[PDB]
Design a protein around this ligand. Structure first.
Ligand SMILES: CCCCCCCCCCCCCCCCCC(=O)OC[C@H](COP(=O)(O)OCCN)OC(=O)CCCCCCCCCCCCCCCCC
Lengths: 69, 318
């Protein structure tokens, strides 16, 4: 008969050993640019809302002071 | 009626601790690419009751304490603090509405370390002493920093009420006006609990939790309790402080839902961080805090003392 030992048609195809750890492109300083940007949004909006809340504050004190007598 | 309120507050935080430990074991399980407990009950919902009544029933086990006072003091203190911390947390409504508030939580959180001094003190084992002193050191050093953060991020509220916080959050989450200080305060919340990276450990190490986690059996189910419950807290107090939902009155359970979801997810992130990273060595930790956090906190703070007066929006104390 023939022999049943293993090796097949040669090569088993290619195999990739070498190291790969790629792909993060979002990082220049521009990460700072987007974060600091987010701050620049927060202070804008929050500024507005605190102004509004002061307006309400004066209005409430007006309620009280009109009550006082 | 009022004791009904108390019970409805404190019983569900205990059940929350048990089923929390469940979710911990599972999330770490799959995060580790392996199923968590399935074989206690269906899907793992009977696992806490196992841990509970067993871990209660294993016998007291050692040693002569040398102080009968402290040994039965420290657990009572650790719990009592961990339970009363939950009082002011806003919810739709606080269950005690305090004018000061958040600095009351800060204060009791500062008291929480006597359980470590005394707990580690009554061991009579001179090694567990040293370990305890050190854990007190790191907890205390991060009681420095955190306080300054609250004293900053609050300065956009204008008052301590802890209710008006939900009023500031209406337009924009407080994470946007300061993200970085919120980042530092998240890691600060990792500090006291000593979740990884900040945990101490078994094998070879200072082994503070060696005798601390070993000793006192059932009362270790207590220190266990106050530690996890305290975790759920700091997650919730994060969810309230640095973000939040819109409160629609006439239907508070809406805000309660959204609040709950974000808080739970946050705690999930604790348990999976603990999975994720190694531990710092001790000194590199302590003077990692002293090196970098505290200076930048000072900078951001003074920048939040000077900022609101710049833009002319300074918050409306009621
Ligand atoms: C051998 C040891 C034996 C003892 C063991 C004790 C174990 C537990 C220890 C930790 C617990 C400490 C609890 C401290 C509670 C402090 C409460 C507080 O400061 O509340 C602030 C709040 C302010 O109210 P405000 O919002 O301004 O106004 C309401 C509307 N006008 O205030 C109020 O609303 C007014 C509340 C006044 C009520 C009386 C307070 C008495 C406190 C007694 C403390 C006794 C224990 C001392 C701590 C021991 C620590 C080891």
């Amino acid at each position: 008969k023939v022999k049943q030992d293993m090796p097949p048609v040669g090569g088993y195809g290619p195999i990739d050993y070498k190291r790969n750890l790629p792909r993060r492109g979002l990082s220049g300083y521009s990460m700072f640019a987007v974060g600091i940007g987010a701050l620049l949004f927060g202070y804008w909006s929050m500024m507005r809302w605190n102004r509004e809340r002061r307006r309400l504050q004066i209005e409430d004190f007006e309620a009280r002071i009109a009550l006082m007598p | 009626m009022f004791m009904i309120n108390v019970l409805t507050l404190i019983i569900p935080i205990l059940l929350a601790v048990a089923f929390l430990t469940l979710v911990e074991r599972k999330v770490l399980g799959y995060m580790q690419f392996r199923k968590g407990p399935n074989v206690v009950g269906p899907y793992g919902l009977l696992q806490p009751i196992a841990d509970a009544i067993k871990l209660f029933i294993k016998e007291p086990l050692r040693p002569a304490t040398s102080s009968i006072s402290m040994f039965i003091l420290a657990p009572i203190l650790a719990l009592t603090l961990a339970l009363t911390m939950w009082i002011p947390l806003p919810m739709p409504y606080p269950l005690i509405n305090m004018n000061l508030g958040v600095l009351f939580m800060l204060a009791m959180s500062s008291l929480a370390v006597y359980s470590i001094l005394w707990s580690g003190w009554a061991s009579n084992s001179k090694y567990a002493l040293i370990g305890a002193l050190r854990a007190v050191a790191q907890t205390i050093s991060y009681e420095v920093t955190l306080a300054i953060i609250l004293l900053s991020v609050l300065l956009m509220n204008g008052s301590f009420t802890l209710s008006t916080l939900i009023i500031t959050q209406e337009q924009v989450w407080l994470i946007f006006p300061a993200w970085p200080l919120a980042m530092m305060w998240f890691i600060s919340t990792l500090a006291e609990t000593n979740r990884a990276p900040f945990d101490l450990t078994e094998g070879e190490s200072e082994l503070v939790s060696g005798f601390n986690v070993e000793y006192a059996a059932g009362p270790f189910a207590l220190f266990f309790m106050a530690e996890y419950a305290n975790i759920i807290m700091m997650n919730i107090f994060t969810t309230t402080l640095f973000l939040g939902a819109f409160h629609n009155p006439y239907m508070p359970e809406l805000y309660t839902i959204n609040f709950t979801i974000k808080s739970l997810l946050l705690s999930i992130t604790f348990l999976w961080i603990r999975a994720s990273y190694p531990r710092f060595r001790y000194d590199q930790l302590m003077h990692l805090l002293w090196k970098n956090f505290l200076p930048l906190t000072l900078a951001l703070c003074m920048w939040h003392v000077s900022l609101p007066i710049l833009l002319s929006s300074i918050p409306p104390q009621t």
